[PDB]
Design a protein around this ligand. Structure first.
Ligand SMILES: O=S(=O)(O)c1cccc2cccc(Nc3ccccc3)c12
Length: 159
């Protein structure tokens, strides 16, 4: 079955620039700006569109070794990105996949709002609990803030 979670986050970075950096260049930026959270990102297959698979490795001491993420859809106009966690970490005999969707929306103050949906697809109704969701949210926030800080400090990056 499916467990659905929605949340929102904010940024002081305009939507298009944040999308370009945080979504379209995460394979390069995440290990650079958040080495304590992400040890490396490997492209396994594909040229960036639907079906592209990446292997995201975590540092020593983290709960999980790695996850493999698959790009589902990328909307460069509406700043929407969909991807699924398809192997590693929590995925296995109790969890088939995590299907994620992010949309970045401009605000009039020059910032943005990130609208985030995560759908956990379980095998044999193994309850997804608050603790896993909390962890995932903390990681996403850590990554967002690290990228934000980088974009604040490097004005010529991603215009
Ligand atoms: O989707 S993520 O890419 O991790 C993500 C990316 C960027 C910011 C996020 C902020 C809060 C929660 C997230 N994840 C989350 C995790 C579980 C349930 C609901 C949201 C964020």
């Amino acid at each position: 079955g499916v467990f659905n979670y929605e949340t929102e986050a904010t940024s002081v970075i305009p939507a298009a620039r944040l999308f370009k950096a945080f979504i379209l260049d995460g394979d390069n930026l995440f290990p650079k700006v958040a080495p304590q959270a992400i040890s490396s990102v490997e492209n396994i297959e594909g040229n960036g569109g639907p079906g592209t698979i990446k292997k995201i490795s975590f540092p020593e001491g983290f709960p999980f070794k790695y996850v493999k993420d698959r790009v589902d859809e990328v909307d460069h106009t509406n700043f929407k990105y969909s991807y699924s966690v398809i192997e590693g970490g929590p995925v296995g005999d109790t969890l088939e996949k995590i299907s994620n969707e992010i949309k970045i929306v401009a605000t009039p103050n020059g910032g943005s709002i990130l609208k985030i949906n995560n759908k956990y697809h379980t095998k044999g109704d193994h309850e997804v609990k608050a603790e896993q969701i909390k962890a995932s949210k903390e990681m996403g926030e850590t990554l967002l803030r690290a990228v934000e800080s980088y974009l604040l400090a490097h004005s010529d990056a991603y215009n």
